[PDB]
Amino acid sequence: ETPSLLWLDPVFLAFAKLYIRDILDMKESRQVPGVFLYNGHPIKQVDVLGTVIGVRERDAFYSYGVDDSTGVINCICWKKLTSQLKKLQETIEQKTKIEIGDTIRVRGSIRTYREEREIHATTYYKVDDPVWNIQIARMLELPTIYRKVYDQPFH
Amino acid sequence: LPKPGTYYLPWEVSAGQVPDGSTLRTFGRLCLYDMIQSRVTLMAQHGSDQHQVLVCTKLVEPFHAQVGSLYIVLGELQHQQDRGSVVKARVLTCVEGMNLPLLEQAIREQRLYKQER
Amino acid sequence: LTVQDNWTLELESSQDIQDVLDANKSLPESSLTDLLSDNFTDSLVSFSAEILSRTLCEPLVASLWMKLGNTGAMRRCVKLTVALETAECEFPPHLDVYIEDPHLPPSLGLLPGARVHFSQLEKRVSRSHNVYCCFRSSTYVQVLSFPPETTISIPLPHIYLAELLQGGQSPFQATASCHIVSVFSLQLFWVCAYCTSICRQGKCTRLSTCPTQTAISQAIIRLLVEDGTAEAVVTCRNHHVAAALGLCPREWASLLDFVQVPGRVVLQFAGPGAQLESSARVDEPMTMFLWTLCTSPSVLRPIVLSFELERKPSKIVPLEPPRLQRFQCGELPFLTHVNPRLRLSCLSIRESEYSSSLGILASSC
DNA sequence: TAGG
Ligand SMILES: [Zn+2]
Numbered sequence: 001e002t003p004s005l006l007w008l009d010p011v012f013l014a015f016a017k018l019y020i021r022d023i024l025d026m027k028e029s030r031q032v033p034g035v036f037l038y039n040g041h042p043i044k045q046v047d048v049l050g051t052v053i054g055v056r057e058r059d060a061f062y063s064y065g066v067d068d069s070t071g072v073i074n075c076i077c078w079k080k081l082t083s084q085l086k087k088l089q090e091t092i093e094q095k096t097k098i099e100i101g102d103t104i105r106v107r108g109s110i111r112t113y114r115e116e117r118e119i120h121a122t123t124y125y126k127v128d129d130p131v132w133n134i135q136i137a138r139m140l141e142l143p144t145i146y147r148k149v150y151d152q153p154f155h
Numbered sequence: 156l157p158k159p160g161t162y163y164l165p166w167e168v169s170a171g172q173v174p175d176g177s178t179l180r181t182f183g184r185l186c187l188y189d190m191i192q193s194r195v196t197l198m199a200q201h202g203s204d205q206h207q208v209l210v211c212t213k214l215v216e217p218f219h220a221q222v223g224s225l226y227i228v229l230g231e232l233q234h235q236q237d238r239g240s241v242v243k244a245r246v247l248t249c250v251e252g253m254n255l256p257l258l259e260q261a262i263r264e265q266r267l268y269k270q271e272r
Numbered sequence: 273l274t275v276q277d278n279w280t281l282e283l284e285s286s287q288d289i290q291d292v293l294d295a296n297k298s299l300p301e302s303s304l305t306d307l308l309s310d311n312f313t314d315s316l317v318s319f320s321a322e323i324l325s326r327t328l329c330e331p332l333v334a335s336l337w338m339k340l341g342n343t344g345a346m347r348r349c350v351k352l353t354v355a356l357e358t359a360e361c362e363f364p365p366h367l368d369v370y371i372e373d374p375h376l377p378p379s380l381g382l383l384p385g386a387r388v389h390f391s392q393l394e395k396r397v398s399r400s401h402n403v404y405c406c407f408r409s410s411t412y413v414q415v416l417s418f419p420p421e422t423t424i425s426i427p428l429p430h431i432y433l434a435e436l437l438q439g440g441q442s443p444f445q446a447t448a449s450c451h452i453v454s455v456f457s458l459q460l461f462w463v464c465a466y467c468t469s470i471c472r473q474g475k476c477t478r479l480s481t482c483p484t485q486t487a488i489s490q491a492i493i494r495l496l497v498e499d500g501t502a503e504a505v506v507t508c509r510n511h512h513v514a515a516a517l518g519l520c521p522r523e524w525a526s527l528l529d530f531v532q533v534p535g536r537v538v539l540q541f542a543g544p545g546a547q548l549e550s551s552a553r554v555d556e557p558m559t560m561f562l563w564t565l566c567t568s569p570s571v572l573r574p575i576v577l578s579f580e581l582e583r584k585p586s587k588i589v590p591l592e593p594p595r596l597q598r599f600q601c602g603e604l605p606f607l608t609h610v611n612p613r614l615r616l617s618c619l620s621i622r623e624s625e626y627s628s629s630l631g632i633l634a635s636s637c
Numbered sequence: 638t639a640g641g
Contacts, residue, residue, distance in 0.1 A: 006608070008611060009608075011501065011502075013597070019268075034601065036601075054156030054157070065156040067160070067180075069161045070265070081530045083557065085557075088564060092569070102248055122544070122545075131253055131629060132227065132250075134630070136253070145500060253627070253629045331638090368640095370638080404639075584640085586640085
């Protein structure tokens with residue numbers, strides 16, 4: 001495999017948005033139990049996006065289970081001049097208040113919740129993507145972002 | 156919480172080739188929506204014929220309809236009986252404007268990438 | 273021996289002798305390694321090159337501050353863009369070329385945008401390590417083709433940074449999709465003219481400088497952006513501030529007019545979730561509004577960024593050696609020996625160019 | 638002579 005000391009790796013410093021099915025299939029490294037391996041390429045806080053099948057009002061987090069027709073994976077979505085601030089929230093409180101029955105993106109840390117590849121949201125937002133408008137370019141770059149480096153060997 | 160469903164070709168779903176039962180995501184143009192059981196009638200045609208899948212929402216009670224619009228349902232498409240394909244709308248979203256055949260093209264590219272291991 | 277006062281020259285036409293004139297390998301022209309060598313073994317270099325801009329200035333005195341002896345003739349310095357040219361450097365590099373004006377009214381063809389070859393001009397390296405050229409006793413310059421007439425411009429490519437480990441050997445100017453993750457340092461700096469000293473409400477305190485009366489609005493914003501492969505450090509001054517925020521003319525106007533009163537408000541940022549790292553006022557209302565935005569994807573926008581390396585290939589003294597990492601993915605921080613951040617100056621902010629069919633209910637005001 |  002690839003030791004932790006074998007990671008000048010770019011995404012070892014940056015986020016990533018990878019194949020949820022192969023993210024499931026991403027080798028949970030035995031060097032540190034919980035970093036995902038896309039043929040051996042480590043991330044710090046991965047990115048996912050998809051339709052949400054599950055929503056539970058937990059103590060600190062929504063429970064957003066995203067599938068993008070690639071596969072399921074679940075997200076512990078940690079519950080997220082000043083006069084004109086009256087209107088301020090009125091443009092981001094919307095994109096930070098989601099219900100069930102649409103599409104949502106999540107990014108953030110990786111953890112292992114009893115056989116589930118549990119994402120833990122460091123950043124996310126409500127999206128108007130349920131139409132999958134971005135989806136053309138999104139999953140045209142997704143096979144590309146896979147075939148480019150991470151699935152391939154590191155150099 | 157539910158299972159995943161890919162995008163099989165939208166004119167092979169309602170015919171009986173893809174294994175039904177398991178979760179699936181499919182689109183279809185609303186023509187005569189049913190409100191009681193929340194039954195959409197998604198159409199299916201790509202220059203071949205007119206197949207049709209059905210949609211029966213389960214989880215969300217407040218979901219309305221729209222005239223002349225495709226709908227994406229992700230959920231349980233069981234092995235529905237004669238002339239029917241019901242996808243239990245545990246995920247229910249709208250489709251309009253977006254170039255959908257190109258979407259299925261990218262989906263086929265994804266299925267191609269599935270092989271590159 | 274000098275030419276005499278009544279002699280005659282004659283072109284022994286190129287069509288007259290052909291033994292060695294067939295091998296007329298380019299009139300002196302130093303090459304890649306030469307100009308990429310802090311100690312080019314000679315005093316004079318020579319190169320093909322094409323210019324993008326020309327600019328003039330006084331022949332300032334060393335350190336800007338010297339004696340009151342005389343006013344030496346205005347040997348006015350001139351700096352010229354050069355898109356360096358030879359066989360190698362397969363992507364367009366650049367440099368500045370300096371020329372003095374002591375006895376040297378510049379030759380013709382010296383326009384931004386022509387084709388010209390030079391020779392026997394001094395290449396050296398500055399106290400600030402920059403590489404440069406100058407004139408000598410054998411200066412050489414000759415146009416190759418007139419500056420054009422079709423002034424069609426050329427924008428920057430559309431790529432992904434999964435190919436850009438190095439700092440050069442690449443489309444130096446480029447563009448790529450990405451998502452902002454943080455700010456770096458914002459300063460709203462209403463300051464004087466000749467010295468740019470702090471002006472509270474638009475009125476300075478050091479004002480002993482000059483009879484200017486209205487301050488200058490130095491607006492600096494600097495961002496941190498992820499791009500799918502690596503990090504992205506970005507800086508901008510006076511142009512990309514209200515846009516990176518997202519304020520229209522009247523909106524950024526009212527912003528500066530509230531912030532007018534202090535004239536100098538500053539924050540520092542270094543990453544996602546990182547709070548104020550400068551010494552702004554915890555009590556001022558604009559501070560709290562600004563940071564309420566600094567905890568929003570409104571300041572972290574997934575957008576397209578235009579970038580070119582900040583430390584020019586004049587002489588890139590490397591920033592810092594590799595460093596360490598103690599950060600968690602899974603349930604454990606893990607260590608390696610990796611490299612620090614980068615310098616990609618922003619060039620044109622491309623906003624959320626994502627699809628427009630997220631809703632056909634866009635807006636009416 | 639020649640970057641912040
Ligand atoms: Zn001042």
